[model samples]
Target chain A: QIRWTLLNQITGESDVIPLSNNTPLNVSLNFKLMNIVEADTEKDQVEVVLWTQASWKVPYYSSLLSSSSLDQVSLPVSKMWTPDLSFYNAIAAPELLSADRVVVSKDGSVIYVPSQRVRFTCDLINVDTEPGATCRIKVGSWTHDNKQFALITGEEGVVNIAEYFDSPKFDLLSATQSLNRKKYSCCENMYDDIEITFAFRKK
Target chain B: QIRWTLLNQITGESDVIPLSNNTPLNVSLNFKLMNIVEADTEKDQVEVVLWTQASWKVPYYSSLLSSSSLDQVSLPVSKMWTPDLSFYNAIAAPELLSADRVVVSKDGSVIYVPSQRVRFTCDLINVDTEPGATCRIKVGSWTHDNKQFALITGEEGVVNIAEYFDSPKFDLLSATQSLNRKKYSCCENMYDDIEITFAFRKK
Candidate 1:
């Protein structure tokens, strides 16, 4: 488990906070699939909507503000949205988002907070209503934001929304089993685990 | 046909001349067969006596002294002899009557002179005693009064004196051929025709 805190904030000056534990906190935050919507001919529209989440934890602490509310915070958000047949190579204007302060997590000695929650929504117009049509989502930092800042406390997620009107396309030429009985594939993953802890100060 | 001469002592300092054309003259030469003996063996000894009789013509000036009988002339006599042998490596030595001068033909040329008869005789020593035993003669130069003389000019002959003895030791394996065909060999005559001319003065 890991915990983190936001000790203080200055309006004009940069926010500075010292970590209680001598060890540095490693933070990795990214977005996940909450839901997906496929294109429908009757609906006449295809929409891709996603949300980004930042999560981290550090050892608990006291004397910090407790039950404090964040009006806003700042965050960087990016998304890929295209609508052409050869959409993979299509270019688009950059999408940037800065979040307002918000409380994300709290405990007796620390608090996990962010500037705001980043919500990205886009419409891929005139998309074909075919079942096998695929839409790929790539989220990353925009050019305006400091890349180091985002990398230190940023997250990204990719979601593939595949249409399901017909049977899946099976590549017959590429499907083959190993001739050796003792050989095993190297790509099997068994589990994914994530733990978080928080701390705050007394009011 | 080729002509040769045996000159009288009155014609020149050497007293002997080699004739190349038909010349009127009378030359009488006596040939005696000497005993054939093994090089160094008692039981292996085979007594085969062989000799040759040859005469040559002298020029008109040289023949004028035929009536005088005052000038003593010595003719050079030459001949080739072969001893019968039971095996291929059998070695033997041939004896010849001593003469004041001798010339051997190094090339294998035939001697053809008018009024010249070369009679060769040899005893069939150990005839029918050995089944595989046979004789063959080869002539080679033995001496040149002046050791610096390098030319070859003579004639040679061969005669079978005894029948070869057939023994179990005379197996077909006794014959061996070489693989390097480029090397010179005496077992086979596989070259173009060669000619040698012999001439000597009287002593």
Candidate 2:
């Protein structure tokens, strides 16, 4: 399973706070977003992955956190990032969405790599750990061969993991449940269909 | 919403064992499964709440627990037993399985009782605190409940539980993910649909 952490801290304080262990603890943080931009680069229509503006909240821990606004519980999220890098030509690859972003190693270890291969660690803002201030995630795709698959379901066929990263969306989802624990007690976790899509994006 | 414990002790040493919370830290014993009979009964016609033979393996804990089973990524399961009582007519009323064996209290407390109106606790077998035993799940439902529901598309829905206790299942599933936690990042945990079923029972 892809491991991601809540690398968050008050705008001014860093290192003093504890980060969410990719696994949302009972007391955890959540996010909301705004400036999602598709940057300019490598020629083509311009950029590679589109970035979204998101905010943070661990509502239950509101009082326990530092906040300047009475609207506490709403942690101040100066910036947000994700490896949800999309191909500038994503509009052209409809079926690729059905690919499984999660990769299982020969030894059974699993990590997520949306479109490319790299350490499944933090890579939202500038493609590296945001040292010092921000709540930077300290994990992601890791240790293994480059084999990968997209969210596939015999029922739905193929699912694009990037599609869920739609700037319109807000949560980072892990592809499946765990590494060794067999998918039991149920048919399958169906991570393929695990997403909260709105009726029609905003307006 | 129901509480259950794994009542296990080495086959020969049932007294010095630790039966989950049903075999708790102290002061808490839920079930009372005396009707347990394996008579001709085991005649094979087996007309009784015939206790089922079950096994528990918190293998994940092997590395996290203290054990010499290096041979040990799996924590030692001192014993295993189950109390899946059926009137010998469970083959009928398949849908009744969807009923909530767990009752949500007026004030929001949840507890389980298959078809009864009482505290369904330690009665399956014997009980004891397996002190320094290992990482045993001291609580959570492991057996029956009639009402069952597959994972619905959106979040909240009435789900049938007993289905998972299906003689062959893994891990304890909770009533709902969390009380106030909104289903974030995904449509449903799909935890809702986690069940194994046959297209139709044999004739």
Candidate 3:
């Protein structure tokens, strides 16, 4: 009953960003690589199956702790605000492989992990010409600016390869990540993004 | 080898409609009713799992007969033009349940049948007040005009219910269908659509 009441209170608040005192909301983005479906050199495309963990704080739900004995609960992801994260260079929209639900803590912390398969545009010259090829995945909030939203690395770093499957055609080497921030000419507000660079070699 | 050559010729031709002699393309629409997932009287929503069969002619590939011994072949649905049909009153996008492939014949006829589950807005007063509940499904081409496309009923009529799963909560009484044509305010050419009417009674 407590869970139901908590969910009912936030039913219509999905479109509103849970901004605490108008501060920039921080969302952590983490990737769990699973399988490499393709690394097409001719098409300049990289396709992979992966899981994304996106977590953020929703201070409005602090009453969840005092209202119920449970410290965490599961709810539909559509019931609350979520980051509009996307692979900026994706050729087509990613395919979701599982039901979308979120784990929410009493402290207003929320975690959403979705399994997906995506294909992105990438240059493969580094794979053939050098010791390893480098592919970069650029992820960011599509509509929110850095003034309203801030992106951070997840608890498991940028790209967690513990469950990554080795492809017969390529071998994954190393992963590096960075943050990019800039102001677009159309707006005065700055925007932030995360760049995850992967080094892999063709076998 | 012949199948490969035929598919290769049609590669990258998905965007072009297979029009012959400037005539309007005739496409047939058919629905196979499967299961009733929901009939929410409170929400005024009807969700059903069904299969759609869209068939049309492609005269340009008539050489498929002389070039190969096979009368029919299966190819990826992405290799040719497809109608932009949709449920005009759908609350959300339809979910596809099967692989997308088209059966092509030497006579240049093509059949694309896709299994789908869709939820659409409907009025359910007929179920409680009278003999049955009447729900109308309006489907039409979203982009093409009547001059570019002509929609017709399939060989099995508008709705096929031989494989339908009987719902314990409701009994299906009858189905009726019709065609609607009109010229929109922004358009000079006419557009055509199909309306499927279903009568059912709550148990």
Candidate 4:
């Protein structure tokens, strides 16, 4: 079991992150599955939940789900209300990481040492009616830390599921952390407590 | 055909090296093969040869072989003997060659890089009576350059096949080259001219 805490800007609280013993640090992954409509092999595609963990803080966000009964269950991803995150192209290769070679507290695990970084806007689509319709939502946040800018969430914009599915799209990719100091990766869980920058992306 | 002109101390001559192309850079490698008796198929292990390429000016040398009418042969690995070669660690792993990075000029093929060098007294165990007997020989070199230090040949030492193989064994390892400005390795046919050193152990 692993536990990490990230400062929640909205509630001014600590977002506790608890994951299974050893989960890989791959963005192309689902930390947890929720709201399975027909996934039970039962015969219904009601509402499937895909929990996305973002940043070192790993603020959890559940994508594609309807009204929850607000139960006595562990905090749900959708409850965060942060724009349901989505991304592409987080895969890259490397060699000499002499610069960003950081060792976190761990028993026996060897992962990548990150020297460079690349980012793409995460999708905020929640196409519930259309199983796989590409929905659109205006999302922007120059940062994740509450210092300079507030956290970017769907609280400011509306996700027009119907119109968004047909709206002409414009590619949005205009940010990345500077590659000055060497920083390691979490995918391999090479560390115990890896201090990460949620961009810490500010205005 | 790759040629490096090195001044041979003995009889002072120029060594010409030529092969179909650059060969002998594979893991399952026979650096240099010599003294083949027979039984090609049935497999009666006759005298097996393993040529050791030297570091500095690589001059080829094939020890053993009663003048077996030594001549009229393909470019035996003992061709080029020039001090014109300069490479670091050829043993650098594939794509991740973050060490002893050397780029040599060759026609085509892989040659074991000598960043990790090991030199033990060559065994002269010519177990002729026994079709296959692990042999030993005596060998040494004071220099990698061909300038002042003449070529070290078998003429000075005695290749006592029986005595050498029978000699009491003791392991001794010492000495190492400095790690000054270390680099990486080269792949593919990255060269047209490569010289090789040989402590050709004879049977």
Q: What is the TM-score of each predicted model, taking all chains together?
A: 0.20, 0.17, 0.49, 0.14
Q: Tell me the tens digit of each residue's lDDT in model 3 across A1-203.
A: 23445655786777877787878999887776655556778988887666666788887786755565444544556667888888887888887654455656768888776656688987877776546777777788888998789988767544454244544455677776778986777778987888777877775
lDDT of 1 by residue, B72-173 (tens): 211122221111111122243332222212211212111211111121222334333333333332222122111211222222221211112111111111
lDDT of each: 0.23, 0.20, 0.70, 0.21
- Among all windows of ten consecutive residues in candidate 1 chain B, which has the lowest summed lDDT? B194-203
Q: Point out the higher-scoring one by TM-score: 2 or 3.
A: 3
Output DockQ, candidate 4: 0.01
Candidate 4 per-residue lDDT, tens place, B77-103, comes to 222233333222222221211112111
Is candidate 1 or 3 superior in DockQ?
3
If both were scored by TM-score, which would come out higher, candidate 1 or candidate 2?
Answer: 1
lDDT, candidate 1, equals 0.23
Scanning candidate 2 chain A in windows of ten residues, the lowest lDDT window is A140-149
DockQ of each: 0.00, 0.01, 0.01, 0.01
Chain A TM-scores, one per candidate? 0.31, 0.20, 0.89, 0.17
Give Cα distance to truth, residue A113, candidate 3, Å.
32
lDDT of 3 by residue, B1-203 (tens): 25566665665444334556557789888776666778777545678777777899887676656578787888777676667676654545579888878888888888888887877656565666557777777777754567667998854433554346578777777766678897743234677988778777777
Judging by TM-score, tell me the better candidate of 3 and 4.
Answer: 3
